[PDB]
Amino acid sequence: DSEAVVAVDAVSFTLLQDQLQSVLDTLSEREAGVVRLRFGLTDGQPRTLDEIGQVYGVTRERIRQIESKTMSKLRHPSRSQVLRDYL
């Protein structure tokens, strides 16, 4: 059955979600909410840039600048090693 649950990818996916929740929780609240709403980690629905800007009360260029800075912060190795081994 070449399309079954491989029983180690499921537990690896659960540990990946746990580690991603940890690394996202070690940030600022506004940046973490922006990243979650941008990549759809809340409820599986990705949100638009103007939608995040509307619900957080700032402009879209401010939102995308905060997103770029937060993506740099996550790309930094100090936060990035424990997720670098997963991929």
Added chain:
Amino acid sequence: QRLPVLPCHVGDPDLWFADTPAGLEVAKTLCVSCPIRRQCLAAALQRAEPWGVWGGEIFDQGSIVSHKRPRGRPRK
């Protein structure tokens, strides 16, 4: 492996983006003993990182500044 010897992720990661010129100075010089300064600095220069300490050097949005300019009137 050599992970606890790696000076990037030894301590708190929020230090390396502190917005004071004197706070990040020990963060920049703490990568003096880093074993992977060449590849880290090379990746940081090629992918144009806009923030924080990278390869034992600070970064603006595109390039390398020597020391970050403090808040206030600069010295004549």
